[PDB]
Ligand binder design. Structure first.
Ligand code: BNG
Ligand code: BNG
Length: 433
C-alpha cells in the first residue's frame, strides 16, 4: 500500500537526523582521547560540526542537477551508499594518528556524509505533499519530520547505553577504550542504513530558461514573492539557533552544572550523556508530536509564531542568568527551548515551505527555502564555538535571541496553509484575472 513508502522516507529522515546530530555525542569523546588536557580547538571543532550541513546543501544541488538531468532512477540508491562509505572512513580513523590529523580526517568524511544526506532530504517532503492533496497533509509531513527527534533521541539513547557498557573497563584503568566507543556511536547508524538499502532494492538549457522565466514571472508579484521570502527567512532563521544548539547541545550543558569538578573519566562522560538524553527525551523529541496534533487544528502560522516567540524567551533567560544562577533553573529552560524548537518553527518552516507553493514552481521554491535553511544552519555551526571564546556564551545566546524575534516578525509574510490547496489558490488567482 501507500503506507510502506512514507515509512521508508521516515527511516531516511531518521538516519539523516541520527547522522546529523550524533556529532554532538561523539565530539566530547574525541577530546578525552586526543586532547585530554586542552579543549578541541575552536576553529577545528566548528568545521567538523558544520561539515555535515555544508555537504547537505551541496547534495541537494548536485543531486538536483543529476536528478533533473537523468531522472530519479539515477539518484535513488546512490545517495545512501555515499553516507555509508563516509561513515566507514570516519569510523576507522587510524588510532595512532595525531589529534589534529584525526579531526581533519573526520571533518572531510562528514562533508561527503552531508552530500548524501542532502539528496533524500527535500525529496521526502514532495513525495507526500504532491501525493496527499488533503487537509491531513501537514500531519504526514510532521510525522516524517518527527523522525528527526528520534534521530537525536536514539543517538542520545545509544550513548548512555554505550558509556555504561565500558564502565568496569574504564574504572579498571583502560582509559583508551573511549577511542573505541566513539567509533561505535557512528557505526551503529549502519544497521538501519543497510536494512533500508535492501528494501530500496527489494534542450536542457531551453527548458531551464523557460521554467526560470515562469519562476521569475511568478515571484515578481508581491503576494507571491512574499510567500517565498517568508518561507526562506523562517527556515533560514530557525536553523541558526536550531542547529547551532543541537549540534552543540553538549557544549551548553557544560556551562550548566553537568560539567563539574568531581568524578573520574566514566563519571564525567556519563553525567553529560545523562543531560543529553534528558533534554532530547523530555523536550526535543515530544516537540515534534505536539506540532503533529495541532497543525491541522491551530494552523502553521500560530504554531510558528509561538515557536519563534517562546524559544526566544528561554534564550534571554539563559543569557541573562547563565553566569548568575544554578544548574537546575538553567537546565529546565534549556529543555523548554528544545521543546518549542520542534513544537514550533523548526517543524512548521519545513511544513510551510512545502505547503505554500503551487506545484509548478514548488520544486524550486521548496529547494530554495530548504537551501535557505541550511544556510542559517552552517552560519551558526561554523562560528558557534569561536564566538563563545571571543565574546562569551551569554553574548552568543543574545544573538540567537535576536534571530528568534526576526523570525517572529517575518512569519507575518506567510499565508496560512492549513486546509488551503496552493494549486487551487494559484488557479483561482489566475481565473479571476
Ligand atoms: C569518502 C570519505 C573520504 C575520506 C577522505 C579522508 C581525507 C584524510 C585527510 O588526511 C589528512 O589530510 C590533511 C590535509 O589534507 C593532512 O594534513 C594530513 O597529513 C592527512 O593525514
Ligand atoms: C517594510 C515593509 C514591510 C511590509 C511587510 C508587510 C507584510 C504584509 C502581509 O500581509 C498579508 O496580506 C494578505 C492580504 O492581502 C493576507 O492574506 C496575509 O495573511 C497577510 O500576511
Amino acid at each position: 500500500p501507500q503506507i510502506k513508502l512514507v515509512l521508508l522516507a521516515g527511516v531516511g529522515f531518521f538516519l539523516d537526523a541520527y547522522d546529523l546530530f550524533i556529532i554532538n555525542q561523539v565530539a566530547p569523546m574525541l577530546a578525552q582521547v586526543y586532547f585530554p588536557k586542552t579543549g578541541l580547538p575552536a576553529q577545528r571543532q566548528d568545521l567538523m560540526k558544520a561539515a555535515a550541513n555544508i555537504g547537505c546543501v551541496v547534495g541537494q544541488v548536485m543531486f538536483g542537477v543529476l536528478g533533473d538531468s537523468f531522472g530519479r532512477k539515477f539518484v535513488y540508491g546512490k545517495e545512501l551508499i555515499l553516507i555509508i562509505v563516509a561513515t566507514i572512513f570516519q569510523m576507522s580513523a587510524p588510532s595512532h594518528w595525531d589529534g589534529n590529523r584525526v579531526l581533519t580526517w573526520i571533518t572531510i568524511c562528514r562533508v561527503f556524509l552531508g552530500i548524501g544526506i542532502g539528496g533524500d532530504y527535500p525529496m521526502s517532503a514532495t513525495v507526500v505533499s504532491d501525493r496527499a492533496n488533503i487537509h491531513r497533509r501537514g500531519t504526514l509531513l510532521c510525522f516524517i519530520f518527527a523522525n528527526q527527534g528520534w534521530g537525536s533521541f536514539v543517538g542520545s539513547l545509544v550513548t548512555i547505553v554505550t558509556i555504561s557498557g565500558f564502565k568496569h573497563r574504564l574504572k579498571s584503568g583502560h582509559t583508551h577504550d573511549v577511542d573505541k566507543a566513539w567509533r561505535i556511536l557512528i557505526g551503529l547508524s549502519l544497521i538501519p542504513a543497510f536494512g533500508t538499502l535492501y528494501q530500496r532494492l527489494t534542450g536542457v538549457i531551453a527548458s531551464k530558461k523557460a521554467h526560470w522565466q515562469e519562476f521569475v514571472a511568478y515571484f515578481s508579484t508581491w503576494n507571491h514573492f512574499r510567500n517565498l521570502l517568508g518561507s526562506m527567512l523562517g527556515w533560514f532563521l530557525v536553523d541558526i539557533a536550531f542547529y547551532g544548539i543541537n549540534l552543540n547541545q553538549s557544549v551548553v550543558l557544560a556551562q550548566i552544572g553537568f560539567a563539574g569538578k568531581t568524578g573520574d573519566v566514566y563519571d564525567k562522560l556519563f553525567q553529560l550523556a545523562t543531560g543529553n538524553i534528558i533534554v532530547t527525551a523530555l523536550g526535543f523529541l515530544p516537540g515534534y508530536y505536539f506540532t503533529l496534533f495541532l497543525i491541522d487544528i491551530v494552523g502553521r502560522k500560530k504554531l510558528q509564531f509561538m515557536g519563534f516567540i517562546m524559544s526566544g524567551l528561554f534564550l534571554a533567560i539563559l543569557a541573562g542568568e547563565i553566569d548568575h544562577i544554578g544548574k537546575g533553573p538553567l537546565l529546565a529552560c534549556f529543555t523548554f527551548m528544545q521543546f518549542f524548537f520542534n513544537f514550533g518553527a523548526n517543524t512548521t518552516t519545513f511544513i510551510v515551505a512545502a505547503e505554500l507553493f503551487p506545484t509548478r514552481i514548488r520544486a524550486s521554491a521548496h529547494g530554495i527555502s530548504a537551501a535557505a535553511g541550511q544556510c542559517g544552519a552552517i552560519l551558526s555551526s561554523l562560528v558557534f564555538n569561536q564566538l563563545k571564546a571571543k565574546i562569551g556564551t551569554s553574548a552568543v545566546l543574545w544573538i540567537f535571541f535576536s534571530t528568534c524575534i526576526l523570525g517572529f516578525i517575518s512569519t507575518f509574510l506567510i499565508d496560512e496553509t492549513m486546509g488551503v490547496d496552493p494549486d487551487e489558490k494559484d488557479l483561482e488567482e489566475r481565473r479571476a484575472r
